[PDB]
Amino acid sequence: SMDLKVEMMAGGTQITPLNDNVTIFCNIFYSQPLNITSMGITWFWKSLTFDKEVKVFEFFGDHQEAFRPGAIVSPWRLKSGDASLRLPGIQLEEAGEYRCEVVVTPLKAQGTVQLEVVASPASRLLLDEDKYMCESSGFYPEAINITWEKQTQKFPHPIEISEDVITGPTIKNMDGTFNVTSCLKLNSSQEDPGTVYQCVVRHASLHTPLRSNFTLT
Amino acid sequence: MQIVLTQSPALMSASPGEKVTMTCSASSSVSYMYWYQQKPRSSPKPWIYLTSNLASGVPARFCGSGSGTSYSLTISSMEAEDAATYYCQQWSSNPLTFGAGTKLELKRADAAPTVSIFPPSSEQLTSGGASVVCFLNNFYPKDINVKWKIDGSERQNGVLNSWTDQDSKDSTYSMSSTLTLTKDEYERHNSYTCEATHKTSTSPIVKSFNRNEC
Amino acid sequence: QVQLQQPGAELVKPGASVKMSCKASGYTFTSYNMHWVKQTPGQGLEWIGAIYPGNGDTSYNQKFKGKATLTADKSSSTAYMQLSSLTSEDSAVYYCAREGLGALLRDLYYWGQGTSVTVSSAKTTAPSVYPLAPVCGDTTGSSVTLGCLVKGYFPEPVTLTWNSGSLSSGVHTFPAVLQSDLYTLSSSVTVTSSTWPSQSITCNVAHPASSTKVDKKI
Ligand SMILES: *[C@@H]1O[C@H](CO)[C@@H](O[C@@H]2O[C@H](CO)[C@@H](O)[C@H](O)[C@H]2NC(C)=O)[C@H](O)[C@H]1NC(C)=O
Ligand SMILES: *[C@@H]1O[C@H](CO[C@@H]2O[C@@H](C)[C@@H](O)[C@@H](O)[C@@H]2O)[C@@H](O)[C@H](O)[C@H]1NC(C)=O
C-alpha cells in the first residue's frame, strides 16, 4: 500500500503563463530501486467545466506516447523518480485538473493537481485640463483591478485617486485574452507642484502591482 | 488495431418536424466520439465533441450520446437546414478514423419522374459519334433504375449517368442518362428505349423512338 | 479569427508531385496540431496525418506513408503536404485542419476550404455543343423538355445558361462526368410548347480554359 507513493505540487495548484513551457510535477517514492522498464506512468487531463477526462500521455516502460502534441516525460529523469509532465507552449483551454497515475505492478498510486494558465497585463500609459488613459491589455483571467494614486511632496504616502476617474468595461478579445482601459482627468489648477502620479494594475498573474510613473508638465 | 466506424443507415429521409436518429458503430471500444456536419461544396464543421457536447452555434435540437462501441446523433425536430451528411470520427488509437457518413435528406411525397428521350444531333453524327440522352426529372425518392434497350435488347456498355442534388424548392431529384455509340453502330439498329423503374409504380416508364422515322 | 487559407485548386500531371500549402493565422501556429484529410466522393473522409509545428512531430496513416509528407514553416505559419508521383487515385480535395487542445484535443475544429486536386494528362479542349430536341419536333400537351449536351472538354469548368440567364426556371444542369479523360455535361429545361419550335431557346456554353463561348439555338 505505502511501498509506492506519489506527491504533487504542495498546495495542489500550479500556475503557468500562456505560451510558456509548463512542467506538471509528479514525484515517485518506492521502497525498492526503480526499474523504469517495469514501470508505467499515465497522465490524464480533466476539464473543470465539462468534467470529462482524457488520457494525455502514457509511458509503457520502454517507450512513450503523447496524445497532447509535444507532451513528454524524460526517461533520464524518471529514474530519480521524476514523472513530471512537460507541456510545450501551454494554452488557455488546457487549464484543469491533471492526474498522474503510477503503476509498479502490483502496486498503483496517483495524485492530482490543478493547473491555471494566466496572461500578464500589458499596461500602456498615454496622454490624450489633462485627460490620462491607461490601457492594460492581453491578460487572463478577466478580473483585474486598475487604480490611480498620487504622492505629493507634502504627503509622500501614496493615496488612491477616486475622483474624475472612469474605468471602462473589460472587453474580451479573440485569442481569449482580455482588455480594459481607465481614464483619469487631472486639473493642474487643483494639483500641487511636482506631484507623482501612477496607474496601478493588480492582477492574478502579478505578484506585485504593475505601476506606471508620470508627472504633469 | 485500426478502429472501423460503421454509420447506419447510409441514407436517411426526414420530414420537417420528425425525430431523427443516426448511429455510429465502432469495431472496438472508443473513449469518445466526435461528429461533423458537411454540406455540398464546403468543408465539414465540428458538430459534436467529447461524445455529447455541442460545438458553439449548433442548435440545441441536436443531441449526441453513446458509450463503448455504440453512439448516436439525434435531432429532436428535423429542419430543412439540417439536411446534410454527418460523419463520426474517433481517435482513441491510431489511425484517426471517420465513419462513411450518413446523408440526411428532406422527406417528401413520392413523385414519379417525367421522362424524355432525345436522339443524336446531326452535328455529332457528322463527327462519327452518337449520344442518345434520357432525362428523368423531378422524382422522389432518389433511388431509381434506368435500363437502355437497343431494338428490345438491354445494353449496359457505354452508359453514363449523373444526378442533381435534392432540389432546394421542391425536394425532388433529377437524373440524366446518356448512351454513347459510334455513328455506325447507332445506324445498325432502329429502336432506342429508355426504361425507368421507380418506387412509384410496379410498371416501368418507357420512352423511346425509331431512327429515320423522320 | 482562426483562419486556414488553402489555394482553391491544382491541376497536376500523373507521375508528378505537388505541394499543398495551408496559411495559418489568428493563433499560435506552433502550439496546435495541423491535420490533413483526403476527400474523394468514393471514400468519404480519410485521415492522412498530422504534424505539431513546434518540434515537427508527425503522426501518419499507414496507407499514406511514402505518399504524403507533412512539413511546416514556422516563420510563415504555413503547413505543407506533398504528394509524390501522383495517379488519378490521388485526385481529390485535400483539407487542412487544426486540432484543438483541452476539451477539444483530438477534434478537428477548424478547417481550410480545401484544395481540389485533379491528376490528369488531358490538355485543354473546347467542348462540342449539341442540341437536344424530340425526334420530329413534336410536342404533346402544355410543355416540352429540350436540352443541351456539352461533350468532350477539359479542364473544368464550363458555364451554361439559357437565353442569357433570362430563362432559369424549369432548368436542371447536371454534374459533369468524366468521359474518356474529358468532361461531358448536360442541361434540361422545360418550357411552353405554345411557342416551340416556333420560337427557339438558346443554350449558352462558356469554357474559359479554351476561351470558347458558344450559343446553341434549339
Ligand atoms: C486590446 O488592446 C490591445 C493592445 O493594443 C489591442 O491590440 C493592438 O491593437 C492595435 C490597434 O488596434 C495594434 O496597432 C497593435 O499591434 C495590437 N497589439 C498590441 C499593441 O497589443 C487590441 O485591439 C485590444 N482589444 C480589442 C477589443 O481590440
Ligand atoms: C519554451 O521552449 C522553447 C525551446 O524548447 C524547445 O523547442 C520547442 C520548440 C519544443 O520543441 C521543446 O520541446 C524544446 O525543448 C524556448 O525557445 C522558449 O524560450 C521557451 N520559453 C517559452 C516560449 O515560454
Does CATH number 2.60.40.10 belong to domain A1-119? Answer: yes
- Give yes or no for C52 touching A (CB within 8 A): yes
Does CATH number 3.50.50.60 belong to domain A120-217? Answer: no
Q: How far apart are CA A185 and CA A125, in angstroms?
A: 13
Residue C97 near residue C37 (C-beta atoms within 8 A): yes
Decide if C128 and B161 are in contact by the 8 Å CB cutoff: no
Q: How far apart are CA C202 and CA C161, in angstroms?
A: 8
Q: How far apart are CA C112 and CA C98, in angstroms?
A: 9
Interface of B with A (CB under 8 A): 31-32, 50, 53
Q: How far apart are CA A108 and CA B37, in angstroms?
A: 42
**Ligand nearest A17 Cα, by number?**
2
- Give yes or no for A89 touching C (CB within 8 A): yes
> Could you tell me the three cell numbers for A120?
500578464
Beta strands at C177-179 and A85-87: parallel, antiparallel or unpaired = unpaired
Strands (E), A73-215: 85-87, 96-104, 107-118, 122-127, 131-139, 145-151, 159-160, 165-167, 171-172, 178-185, 196-202, 210-214
Residue C145 near residue C190 (C-beta atoms within 8 A): yes
3-class DSSP state of C150: strand
Question: Using CB atoms, which residue from C33, C57, C102 is nearest to A94?
Answer: C102
The alpha carbon torsion through B54, B57, B62, B66 (nearest 10 deg) reads: -10
Residue A30 near residue A103 (C-beta atoms within 8 A): no
Planar angle of CA C203, C206, C211, nearest 5 degrees: 145
Q: How far apart are CA C182 and CA B180, in angstroms?
A: 14
B162 forms bridges with which residues in the sheet? B176
How many angstroms is the resolution? 2.5
The count of CB pairs under 8 A between chains A and B is 7
Topology match between the domains A1-119 and A120-217: yes
Q: Which residue of A has its CA nearest to C55?
A: A70
**Secondary structure element (H or E) that encloses residue B184, with its range:** helix B183-186
> Could you tell me the three cell numbers for A165?
476617474
Question: Using CB atoms, which residue from C28, C54, C103 is nearest to A70?
Answer: C54
Q: How far apart are CA B212 and CA C14, in angstroms?
A: 44
Q: How far apart are CA B49 and CA B33, in angstroms?
A: 7
CA of residue A138 to ligand 2 center, whole Å: 21
> Could you tell me the three cell numbers for B86?
454527418
Residue C14 near residue C87 (C-beta atoms within 8 A): yes
Residue B108 near residue B140 (C-beta atoms within 8 A): yes
> Could you tell me the three cell numbers for C122?
488531358
Q: Which residue of C has its CA nearest to B137?
A: C172
- Residue A69, preceding peptide bond in cis (omega within 30° of 0): no
Residue C208 near residue C126 (C-beta atoms within 8 A): no
- Give yes or no for A55 touching B (CB within 8 A): yes
C129 forms bridges with which residues in the sheet? C150
3-class DSSP state of B115: strand
Domain segments of chain A as ranges: 1-119, 120-217
Q: Which position has the grid cell 458537411?
A: B38
Exposed e or buried b per residue across A50-87, where buried means at least 16 C-beta atoms within 10 angstroms of its C-beta: eebebbbbbbeeeebebbbbbbbbeeeebeebebbbeb
**Secondary structure element (H or E) that encloses residue C115, with its range:** strand C115-119
Q: How far is CA A151 from CA A135, A210, A213, C62, in A?
A: 21, 16, 11, 69
Q: How far apart are CA A95 and CA A81, in angstroms?
A: 25
Nearest Cα residue to B191 out of B177, B207, B206, B210: B210
Residue A151 near residue A160 (C-beta atoms within 8 A): no
Q: In whole angstroms, what separates CA C74 from the centre of its chain?
A: 29
Question: Using CB atoms, which residue from A50, A54, A55 is nearest to B53?
Answer: A50
**Secondary structure element (H or E) that encloses residue C51, with its range:** strand C44-52
> How many Cα atoms sit within 13 Å of A2 on the Cβ side?
0
Residue C69 near residue C12 (C-beta atoms within 8 A): no
Nearest Cα residue to C96 out of C43, C51, C30, C40: C51
Q: Which position has the grid cell 505537388?
A: C18
**After which residues, if any, is chain C broken (C to N > 2.5 Å)?**
none
Q: How far apart are CA A62 and CA A38, in angstroms?
A: 8
Q: How far is CA B72 from CA A80, A172, B45, in A?
A: 47, 35, 17
Q: How far apart are CA C100 and CA C27, in angstroms?
A: 11
* Nearest CA distance, A58 vs chain B (angstrom): 12
Domains of chain B: 1-108 (2.60.40.10), 109-214 (2.60.40.10)
Beta strands at B53-54 and B45-49: parallel, antiparallel or unpaired = antiparallel
Q: Which position has the grid cell 511636482?
A: A194
Residue A181 near residue A133 (C-beta atoms within 8 A): yes
Which chain C residues are within 8 Å of B118, Cβ to Cβ?
A: 132-135, 147
CA of residue A88 to ligand 2 center, whole Å: 6
> How many Cα atoms sit within 13 Å of A72 on the Cβ side?
10
Q: How far apart are CA B208 and CA B153, in angstroms?
A: 13
Nearest Cα residue to B155 out of B180, B137, B130, B175: B180
Q: How far apart are CA C49 and CA C38, in angstroms?
A: 10
Burial of A161 (C-beta count, 10 Å sphere; 0-12/13-18/19+): middle
Q: How far apart are CA A101 and CA A43, in angstroms?
A: 6
Residue C33 near residue C107 (C-beta atoms within 8 A): no
Residue C101 near residue B47 (C-beta atoms within 8 A): no
User: What are residue B180's phi and psi, to 5 degrees?
Assistant: -110, 130
Domain segments of chain C as ranges: 1-121, 122-218
- Give yes or no for C62 touching B (CB within 8 A): yes
Q: How far apart are CA C5 and CA C25, in angstroms?
A: 9
> Could you tell me the three cell numbers for A142?
478577466
Q: How far apart are CA C149 and CA B66, in angstroms?
A: 49
The count of CB pairs under 8 A between chains A and C is 54
Q: How far apart are CA B75 and CA A152, in angstroms?
A: 68
Q: What is the secondary structure of A34-71 as a DSSP string?
A: --GGG-EEEEEEE-TTT--EEEEEEEESS-EEESSTT-
Nearest Cα residue to C27 out of C92, C93, C104: C104
Domain C1-121 is of which CATH architecture? Answer: Sandwich (2.60)
> How many Cα atoms sit within 13 Å of C178 on the Cβ side?
9
Burial of C21 (C-beta count, 10 Å sphere; 0-12/13-18/19+): middle
Nearest Cα residue to B34 out of C91, A13, C99: C99
**After which residues, if any, is chain B broken (C to N > 2.5 Å)?**
none
Identity (one letter) of the amino acid at C97? A
Longest dimension (CA), chain A: 80
Q: How far apart are CA C11 and CA C91, in angstroms?
A: 9
Burial of C96 (C-beta count, 10 Å sphere; 0-12/13-18/19+): buried
What CATH number was assigned to the domain covering residues C122-218?
Answer: 2.60.40.10
Nearest Cα residue to C202 out of C148, C154, C156, C151: C148
> Could you tell me the three cell numbers for B187?
445506324
Nearest Cα residue to C152 out of C117, C181, C119, C120: C181
The alpha carbon torsion through B126, B131, B135, B140 (nearest 10 deg) reads: -170
Residue C68 near residue C36 (C-beta atoms within 8 A): yes
Q: How far apart are CA B208 and CA B158, in angstroms?
A: 18
What is the layout of strands, in order, in the sheet containing C202-207?
A: C159-162, C202-207, C212-217
Nearest Cα residue to A96 out of C101, B208, C19: C101
Q: How far apart are CA C41 and CA C167, in angstroms?
A: 31
Residue B133 near residue B177 (C-beta atoms within 8 A): yes
**Secondary structure element (H or E) that encloses residue B185, with its range:** helix B183-186
- Give yes or no for A72 touching C (CB within 8 A): no
What is chain C's alpha carbon radius of gyration, rounded to the nearest angstrom?
23
A163 Cβ contact list (under 8 Å, min separation 6): none
Q: How far apart are CA B26 and CA B13, in angstroms?
A: 23
- Residue A193, preceding peptide bond in cis (omega within 30° of 0): no
Burial of A172 (C-beta count, 10 Å sphere; 0-12/13-18/19+): exposed
Beta strands at B102-106 and B11-14: parallel, antiparallel or unpaired = parallel
